[PDB]
Design a protein around this ligand. Sequence first.
Ligand SMILES: CC1(C)C(=O)[C@@H](O)[C@H](O)C[C@]1(O)C(=O)O
Ligand SMILES: CC1(C)C(=O)[C@@H](O)[C@H](O)C[C@]1(O)C(=O)O
Ligand SMILES: CC1(C)C(=O)[C@@H](O)[C@H](O)C[C@]1(O)C(=O)O
Ligand SMILES: CC1(C)C(=O)[C@@H](O)[C@H](O)C[C@]1(O)C(=O)O
Ligand SMILES: CC1(C)C(=O)[C@@H](O)[C@H](O)C[C@]1(O)C(=O)O
Ligand SMILES: CC1(C)C(=O)[C@@H](O)[C@H](O)C[C@]1(O)C(=O)O
Ligand SMILES: CC1(C)C(=O)[C@@H](O)[C@H](O)C[C@]1(O)C(=O)O
Ligand SMILES: CC1(C)C(=O)[C@@H](O)[C@H](O)C[C@]1(O)C(=O)O
Ligand SMILES: CC1(C)C(=O)[C@@H](O)[C@H](O)C[C@]1(O)C(=O)O
Ligand SMILES: CC1(C)C(=O)[C@@H](O)[C@H](O)C[C@]1(O)C(=O)O
Ligand SMILES: CC1(C)C(=O)[C@@H](O)[C@H](O)C[C@]1(O)C(=O)O
Ligand SMILES: CC1(C)C(=O)[C@@H](O)[C@H](O)C[C@]1(O)C(=O)O
Ligand code: NA
Ligand code: NA
Ligand code: NA
Ligand code: NA
Ligand code: NA
Ligand code: NA
Ligand code: NA
Ligand code: NA
Ligand code: NA
Ligand code: NA
Ligand code: NA
Ligand code: NA
Ligand code: NA
Ligand code: NA
Ligand code: NA
Ligand code: NA
Ligand code: NA
Ligand code: NA
Ligand code: NA
Ligand code: NA
Ligand code: NA
Ligand code: NA
Ligand code: NA
Ligand code: NA
Ligand code: NA
Ligand code: NA
Ligand code: NA
Ligand code: NA
Ligand code: NA
Ligand code: NA
Ligand code: NA
Ligand code: NA
Ligand code: NA
Ligand code: NA
Ligand code: NA
Ligand code: NA
Lengths: 134, 134, 134, 134, 134, 134, 134, 134, 134, 134, 134, 134
Amino acid sequence: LIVNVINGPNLGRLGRGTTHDELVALIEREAAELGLKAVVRQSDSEAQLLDWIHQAADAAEPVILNAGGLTHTSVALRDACAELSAPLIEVHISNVHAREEFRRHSYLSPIATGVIVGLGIQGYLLALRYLAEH
Amino acid sequence: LIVNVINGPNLGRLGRGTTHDELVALIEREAAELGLKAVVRQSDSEAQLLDWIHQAADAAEPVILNAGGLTHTSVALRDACAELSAPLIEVHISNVHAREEFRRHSYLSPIATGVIVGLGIQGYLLALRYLAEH
Amino acid sequence: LIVNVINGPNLGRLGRGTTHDELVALIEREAAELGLKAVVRQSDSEAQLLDWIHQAADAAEPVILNAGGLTHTSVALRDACAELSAPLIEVHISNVHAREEFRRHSYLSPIATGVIVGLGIQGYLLALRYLAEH
Amino acid sequence: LIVNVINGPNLGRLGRGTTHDELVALIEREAAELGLKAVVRQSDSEAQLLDWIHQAADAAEPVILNAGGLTHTSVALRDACAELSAPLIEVHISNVHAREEFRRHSYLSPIATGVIVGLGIQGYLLALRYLAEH
Amino acid sequence: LIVNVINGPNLGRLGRGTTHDELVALIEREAAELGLKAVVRQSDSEAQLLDWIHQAADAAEPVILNAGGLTHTSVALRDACAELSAPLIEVHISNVHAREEFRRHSYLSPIATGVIVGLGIQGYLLALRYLAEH
Amino acid sequence: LIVNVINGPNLGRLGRGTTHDELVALIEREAAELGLKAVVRQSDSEAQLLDWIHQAADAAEPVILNAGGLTHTSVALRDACAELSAPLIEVHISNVHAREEFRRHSYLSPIATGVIVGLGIQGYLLALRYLAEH
Amino acid sequence: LIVNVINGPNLGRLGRGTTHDELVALIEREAAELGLKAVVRQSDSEAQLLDWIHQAADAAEPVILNAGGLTHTSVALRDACAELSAPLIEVHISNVHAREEFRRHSYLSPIATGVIVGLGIQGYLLALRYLAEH
Amino acid sequence: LIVNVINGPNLGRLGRGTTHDELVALIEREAAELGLKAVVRQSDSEAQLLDWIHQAADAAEPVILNAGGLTHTSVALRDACAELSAPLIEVHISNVHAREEFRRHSYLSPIATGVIVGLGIQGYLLALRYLAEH
Amino acid sequence: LIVNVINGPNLGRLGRGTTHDELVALIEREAAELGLKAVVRQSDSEAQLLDWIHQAADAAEPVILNAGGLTHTSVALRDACAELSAPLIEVHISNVHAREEFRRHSYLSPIATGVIVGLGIQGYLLALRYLAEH
Amino acid sequence: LIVNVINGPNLGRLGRGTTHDELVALIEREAAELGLKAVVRQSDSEAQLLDWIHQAADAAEPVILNAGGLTHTSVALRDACAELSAPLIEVHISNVHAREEFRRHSYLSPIATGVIVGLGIQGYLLALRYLAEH
Amino acid sequence: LIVNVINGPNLGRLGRGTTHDELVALIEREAAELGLKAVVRQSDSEAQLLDWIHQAADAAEPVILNAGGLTHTSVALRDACAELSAPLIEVHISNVHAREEFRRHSYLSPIATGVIVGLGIQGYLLALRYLAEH
Amino acid sequence: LIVNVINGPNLGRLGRGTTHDELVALIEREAAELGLKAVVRQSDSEAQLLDWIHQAADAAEPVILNAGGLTHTSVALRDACAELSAPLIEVHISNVHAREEFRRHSYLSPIATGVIVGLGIQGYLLALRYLAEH
Ligand SMILES: CC1(C)C(=O)[C@@H](O)[C@H](O)C[C@]1(O)C(=O)O
Ligand SMILES: CC1(C)C(=O)[C@@H](O)[C@H](O)C[C@]1(O)C(=O)O
Ligand SMILES: CC1(C)C(=O)[C@@H](O)[C@H](O)C[C@]1(O)C(=O)O
Ligand SMILES: CC1(C)C(=O)[C@@H](O)[C@H](O)C[C@]1(O)C(=O)O
Ligand SMILES: CC1(C)C(=O)[C@@H](O)[C@H](O)C[C@]1(O)C(=O)O
Ligand SMILES: CC1(C)C(=O)[C@@H](O)[C@H](O)C[C@]1(O)C(=O)O
Ligand SMILES: CC1(C)C(=O)[C@@H](O)[C@H](O)C[C@]1(O)C(=O)O
Ligand SMILES: CC1(C)C(=O)[C@@H](O)[C@H](O)C[C@]1(O)C(=O)O
Ligand SMILES: CC1(C)C(=O)[C@@H](O)[C@H](O)C[C@]1(O)C(=O)O
Ligand SMILES: CC1(C)C(=O)[C@@H](O)[C@H](O)C[C@]1(O)C(=O)O
Ligand SMILES: CC1(C)C(=O)[C@@H](O)[C@H](O)C[C@]1(O)C(=O)O
Ligand SMILES: CC1(C)C(=O)[C@@H](O)[C@H](O)C[C@]1(O)C(=O)O
Ligand code: NA
Ligand code: NA
Ligand code: NA
Ligand code: NA
Ligand code: NA
Ligand code: NA
Ligand code: NA
Ligand code: NA
Ligand code: NA
Ligand code: NA
Ligand code: NA
Ligand code: NA
Ligand code: NA
Ligand code: NA
Ligand code: NA
Ligand code: NA
Ligand code: NA
Ligand code: NA
Ligand code: NA
Ligand code: NA
Ligand code: NA
Ligand code: NA
Ligand code: NA
Ligand code: NA
Ligand code: NA
Ligand code: NA
Ligand code: NA
Ligand code: NA
Ligand code: NA
Ligand code: NA
Ligand code: NA
Ligand code: NA
Ligand code: NA
Ligand code: NA
Ligand code: NA
Ligand code: NA
């Protein structure tokens, strides 16, 4: 039923095409179509992201996570995500493999159920659809 | 309209859960639902895979590619895929980031539109859905 | 007399065996037995940890620090800890050397007085005992 | 006209020679002499630094940035700084090349207009003078 | 009841502060206070160290081990230590992380229960106290 | 009073914008304004550069050095520069961190007082101003 | 009873001492002496090797494999070999450790039961003898 | 007299400027002018390339080889080429040193007589001319 | 006629399945069957192993060597083994390639005639059989 | 019309077979046959080589360059060569890929039109022929 | 007056040219000529070498040390040698830089006064002469 | 009879203890005592050093070479030195192994007869004595 979509640093700057408010609206609409409720949250603060992941761990709710630059750098976020019992889908809007070498390593991928990159904002919608069939 | 799904070495051994024939049937059914025609092919021969990629290049048809172990090893396959003008979506059934370090490098990812890993056979269906909306 | 025990990200999630509140109680009891006063604080926010380290620097108070994942990643925390004049003991509950390779590097160890790993929550109590004899 | 000077973690601890309040006063005085207005801000919180960089991006204002330890570690800060359209000058008080090897890599340098290191607090004043002539 | 304390090469040269004979006396006194019997042995010969570890394996006795330079170099010692069923605590007098890079790798740490470094000879006494509570 | 500005290989090719003769004129004008005398010299010969550095060592005169490609390659030049007692400021016109990886290492930076990169020819003028206040 | 001996690229060129036909005859003779039936096959085509490995997986038959240069390069072959339930013995005629560094890594060794190198064609016969006693 | 020109994977796709059929015609014309007979063959199959190299080894005929992506990846092809007694000239149309780092390593170069890169299809003609004078 | 079997550190601990005394008995029985005399020796002391290798060098006798952890670490043992004129077969009971990365390098393999790993104690018997046919 | 052939350090020592004077004569003869004028120069001085490259840049003349050991070491020479507008062909007499690993990296190759190695002094003549057809 | 010459593993095998007994005689003769007394000792046992180094530390006597393979591998020997107050000269008979890469690193060189390699047994005599003038 | 002593960049700056003129005098005196003639030359120019090495190659005269920083950087100097038929002794005044890591690699050591480091100016005199006995 409930799916958490958690966006990390700089994702509030989307579109400055699709803005973060637009993304929320798109996700909510898709979720309803699939019979799910999407809770979409964004923060530039690692501590706030950690708190949202802790809550999803306690509730056994799935998480779709685009951690922004913290993907590549945060062991703390990995440690929190490792506690999740429900699925964790990592999403990147851009194809990180076509950019700098440092973007090709993720602390999150090894502990995620799966990873979608380079499909733009549709990545989020495809992750929802995976969770609805699972 | 037409989407090519190309599976590389050892993918004929799926299920020995879901068999390769079953996967073909699942993909075909999903494609029809989306208004697409899926052409699904599998080979253990790099040369045969190259030929199928060349044909998709000449026809300007999108490709969903699970190259199996060649993902990690074949520059020749990368070179062929670089010629494609329509989208290229790389799919892995397993989460390659939760396995050996060598599986975490792909010669294909940098030249793909995007990459889906770890979502099992649903990865193929989600890639179809991306192409139908694009 | 006064010893600061500072716990970083995810340490509030201990026990979800020993909870963080239990750990506080254990530390306080041991401190009193040794003739010390323990001030035990936890935060998921790097900025908050930095502030507590700055205060210990200004007061010339010893610090027992379990920085969680920031151990492996934060130069900022190292820089703050380098200002401490009293002893700094790094503690990890788990044996970081029996886990992923990335956990085997610490930005803090080179600037600490010493390091205790893998002795569970007793590590904290043993660090207190070192400080009481020093 | 307006230049933002942004100082990151631990820079509030300057002088505990020149204190952070003194640095602000020095910068403001130099700015006025050059016909500029300097807005000088410091934070130990990455999220707060990100917000200030976002604002400078939206206003098309130049930034002089001493990110402290985040220089070496934060992809998130790089990503925010990449959005700036006006110049970005990276400043370090110390000569990072005469210290530990890890300080010799910066996530910011590749995206900065230029970089001044090792000239102490005069680095800030020299960066102002560059911006006044540009 | 019985704890073996095993010191490797060059540890007989302690104090030429605290000498190796003094260390033995300190350990024995602490052990008695904790209700334990400490058997403290030192050798510069890897073969002799191996024999003492084999005996502790056969007797299921805990070991506190400061292997000196062999920490960094001996796979043979690791292999012997891997046979121990009771706890193994690695101790270094100095903080190996504040010295040459080569001292920051240990063949023993991954197979130890835990590791104490940089607390001087008190490290041995703290390891005894861990074993008495375990 | 006297400051030496030493330019290495290929710097005579500046402008083929600002030519090397123009740069000399700009530097001389700025120096006079600051109450300094600038001696500006350029050579493509490492031996000649070494001789000029030796002379500045013997006279205890400050040096502003843009060694061109020798920055990245010459231990001999580092060794000569290490003898200087007065300040040494390394200047690069381009932002070397936005170019090939090999340009991001300098044999000179560790032994320089400070380093200015990416501010174009103004880097030289800013280095003069540092020396006038020091 | 049945053992498959599979030789990869360039092994048909043996002796141009012992030729590949001679090797087949030697293996067959040894197999009969041990009460086994040896099926010896060679191909320069990875796809053909994969097919033979798939068949041995389906039949639960042991495999003695000299993959030639594919040893060092093929993840696809590793993936096929990982499916085998009966033993897999890797054989090299030459001592790969006395040659180029690249020959000292094998994608197959980690998944093999064991590995024999440098014993010439007797390696094959010794592998047969292992399988007869197992 | 006879020279073999062997082209590997994707070289049949030349011109989709100069097509592979055109290249054959150009080579044949140049060969005749030099008093040579050129046998030009292309395949996307490693096994087929191996067979052609084996035949050139048996006939003691020179080889001009553009192995395409296999240059960078195939130990099997190196092993076959090592058997050649007549000269082996490696040719690349593109300048592999101006592309991705992975293209700057060749398994073939160490065993070739020489290597021509970046001179386009004229590289083949220049290799013929070398063989005619040798 | 005479073959030396030399076992290094920790091999006396075999079976605490097959014990070291049992292994000796098995080897002796196999040797007699092959018309050989096996001299089997074990030591945890590198110096003692060196002496036995020196004696085999002086007598021009073949050696089957399982150096235990010294395989991975001892240049001294390599240097002694390099003096042997008769064959040297390296044996490991376990498949070192399926364990830690550090076990995948041997100082001995490059100087050995050949290497058998992962075939358990039968490895020793197979090495004897090689020497009997050679 | 005019082609510069520039030889770097130690190339004056050719033949102490073909001497440097002989090479000049061979090149001049070939050039005339092709309708070109070859200007062949050699120096052991990097500064002198730089000057000759600067002149070829100013005249928009092609360069055939064998930089000797500077190939592997000089960023200054790369920087000068990057200014050339006409083609730059790098030539090595020896096959650098069959020698020490350090010879397999060139600072020049990425900025050259193409590279010929291992064809002896004919490499120079083949480079002339490329330039005559281009 | 007294100089210790300490030879490590395998040095007793010299000449099986100059034997170890001959070397002793040569050293003793040279020492007497210089007014010194040479005590020359050899062992294959690290523990024995450590003891001899400890004694030289306690007596403040200079040491000429050829540690054989332990040069490259023993931190324990480095640690003992670091205690010496009188000079320490490292000697190798062979030129270790012309052999395998692993021989080009020494744990001893950084703590030695100096190092002589590749001058054969004369290296020992030259080291004596250094000590006589110092 | 004749020995060349060649000093590279910055060696003319010795003593600004022993000056370069003093070193020449010391060497000449020692040479005469040994029945040799020493020709001692110094230059900061690589080209000049190359010329002196070429002359020693042509005359078959031994060389004692302290190349200064070029030791670590010049392939050209290595190439010239490789031509020498008489002995080549590399000398460093300082112990390069006790300094920066980059000083621990020499392009010259592999091609030298031997190497003396860290014995100060006596290194030169000891090298002369080696050549007199050889
Ligand atoms: C571009 C984004 C949002 C980002 O912040 C980067 O640091 C990251 O490498 C990729 C990213 O998460 C994305 O493409 O979604
Ligand atoms: C398991 C598959 C099919 C494979 O062949 C592996 O080599 C590859 O690393 C991952 C893979 O492509 C997949 O999970 O789809
Ligand atoms: C498990 C803890 C708390 C942690 O957060 C990890 O990131 C770290 O590697 C180890 C750790 O600090 C610990 O074991 O105390
Ligand atoms: C010393 C400062 C402020 C810092 O925090 C360090 O992490 C950084 O490497 C250098 C630094 O930014 C500086 O010198 O300004
Ligand atoms: C200093 C000691 C004893 C030692 O022998 C070193 O090799 C090791 O790195 C650290 C050490 O074990 C210690 O500090 O106890
Ligand atoms: C471009 C310059 C002058 C140069 O020669 C390069 O080798 C160097 O990497 C940067 C440089 O010194 C500069 O930008 O001033
Ligand atoms: C020599 C062989 C057959 C081979 O093809 C090489 O690529 C490989 O490194 C070793 C090899 O498999 C062998 O020695 O059997
Ligand atoms: C472009 C070609 C043909 C190729 O297939 C690449 O994999 C290779 O790196 C270079 C290449 O062989 C060539 O430029 O001829
Ligand atoms: C397990 C043995 C005996 C050993 O001591 C390890 O150090 C080595 O990596 C492998 C080993 O020699 C063996 O498996 O025979
Ligand atoms: C042998 C030559 C001339 C040379 O000086 C080497 O440093 C270089 O690696 C190769 C070389 O340029 C050549 O083969 O032409
Ligand atoms: C050859 C010697 C004696 C040795 O034992 C090697 O391990 C070492 O690399 C060099 C050596 O010490 C020597 O040449 O004196
Ligand atoms: C100090 C010297 C002269 C030098 O120039 C350095 O570059 C080199 O690393 C060591 C040196 O050659 C020496 O100590 O003789
Ligand atoms: Na929720
Ligand atoms: Na990871
Ligand atoms: Na999209
Ligand atoms: Na199709
Ligand atoms: Na890639
Ligand atoms: Na699925
Ligand atoms: Na407090
Ligand atoms: Na560190
Ligand atoms: Na505990
Ligand atoms: Na502002
Ligand atoms: Na970067
Ligand atoms: Na300042
Ligand atoms: Na005991
Ligand atoms: Na380890
Ligand atoms: Na202590
Ligand atoms: Na001057
Ligand atoms: Na450096
Ligand atoms: Na400028
Ligand atoms: Na079969
Ligand atoms: Na592997
Ligand atoms: Na054989
Ligand atoms: Na043919
Ligand atoms: Na190679
Ligand atoms: Na062309
Ligand atoms: Na014997
Ligand atoms: Na080796
Ligand atoms: Na067995
Ligand atoms: Na010209
Ligand atoms: Na390059
Ligand atoms: Na030639
Ligand atoms: Na003595
Ligand atoms: Na070292
Ligand atoms: Na000698
Ligand atoms: Na001379
Ligand atoms: Na070298
Ligand atoms: Na001296």
